[PDB]
Amino acid sequence: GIDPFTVSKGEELFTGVVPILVELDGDVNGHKFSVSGEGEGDATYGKLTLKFICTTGKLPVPWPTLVTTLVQCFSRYPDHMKQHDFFKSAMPEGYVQERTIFFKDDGNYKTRAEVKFEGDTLVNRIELKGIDFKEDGNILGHKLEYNYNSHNVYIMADKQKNGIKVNFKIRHNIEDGSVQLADHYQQNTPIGDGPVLLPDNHYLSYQSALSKDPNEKRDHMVLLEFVTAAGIT
Ligand code: NA
């Protein structure tokens, strides 16, 4: 376990503005790519501000399809729900997030992310594997609009893994006015062996805004996100 003179642990680590670093290696139908991200999280306000860069050249999938993969420890938990915040409770040692994302009538992503502090910086290191995609489909054919809807993310305890299980549905707008559904199944497990907060059923309410940096010539995404826990009282 951690040093019992650790200065900041659990939710204490999130009372201020925290630098964030994200690193992702991906392979979707053999199209390999990497993404790096930097920004800040201010959990008191549920606020994330990040800029992501495809470091290998052109991103072979639409940026919106990576939003859910690219640090739920920055969610704003109401005071009356603080005992349900698994994500912060696992820090600084961190947690592993695993997902399968089923794109309706297309392929799936499977992801594994390790989220932990490296000093003052909250780091998310991710591997993403996509298979079974249609080369001329909405994903590999880049037919998804550069925008994002608000969603609820449903969280319950997984006592067997000393963690949580999560599911939700993302609707990505297609350029023809239709919808590309992405069904997310998720589990998180702590990296350390200490106590964590196993929550009652609740959800996170997400808002996401995607933009471009007018001075950035690399393939990139600027993301502004607000996340608030809810559904208890
Ligand atoms: Na309860």
UniProtKB/Swiss-Prot annotation:
Domain of life: Eukaryota
Its biological purpose: Energy-transfer acceptor. Its role is to transduce the blue chemiluminescence of the protein aequorin into green fluorescent light by energy transfer. Fluoresces in vivo upon receiving energy from the Ca(2+)-activated photoprotein aequorin.
Stated consequence of mutating residue 179 to A: In mut2.1; shifts fluorescence lifetime from 3.03 to 2.50 ns
Effect of residue 201 to I: In mut2.1; shifts fluorescence lifetime from 3.03 to 2.50 ns
Impact noted for substituting residue 153 to I: In Azurite; shifts the excitation and emission spectra to shorter wavelengths and increases quantum yields compared to BFP
Tissues/organs with expression: Photocytes.
Protein name: Green fluorescent protein
Effect of residue 156 to T: Increases fluorescence at warmer temperatures such as 37 degrees Celsius
One Pfam family here: GFP
Effect noted on mutating residue 205 to F: In H9; increases fluorescence at 395 nm excitation
UniProt effect for mutating residue 150 to P: Increases fluorescence at warmer temperatures such as 37 degrees Celsius
Any GO BP annotation: generation of precursor metabolites and energy
Phenotype when changing residue 71 to N: In R10-3; matures to the red-emitting state with excitation and emission maxima at 555 and 585 nm, respectively
UniProt organism field: Aequorea victoria (Water jellyfish)
Subunit structure: Monomer.
Substitution effect: residue 131 to V: In EBFP2.0; shifts the excitation and emission spectra to shorter wavelengths and increases quantum yields compared to BFP
InterPro entries: GFP, GFP-related, Green_fluorescent_prot
Effect of residue 148 to F: In Sapphire/H9-40; exhibits a huge Stoke's shift, with an excitation peak at 399 nm and an emission peak at 511 nm. In Azurite; shifts the excitation and emission spectra to shorter wavelengths and increases quantum yields compared to BFP
The keyword Transmembrane is annotated on this UniProt entry: no
Family: Belongs to the GFP family.
Reported uses of this protein in biotechnology and industry: Green fluorescent protein has been engineered to produce a vast number of variously colored mutants, fusion proteins, and biosensors. Further generation of mutants led to more stable proteins (at 37 degrees Celsius for example) with brighter fluorescence and longer fluorescence lifetimes.
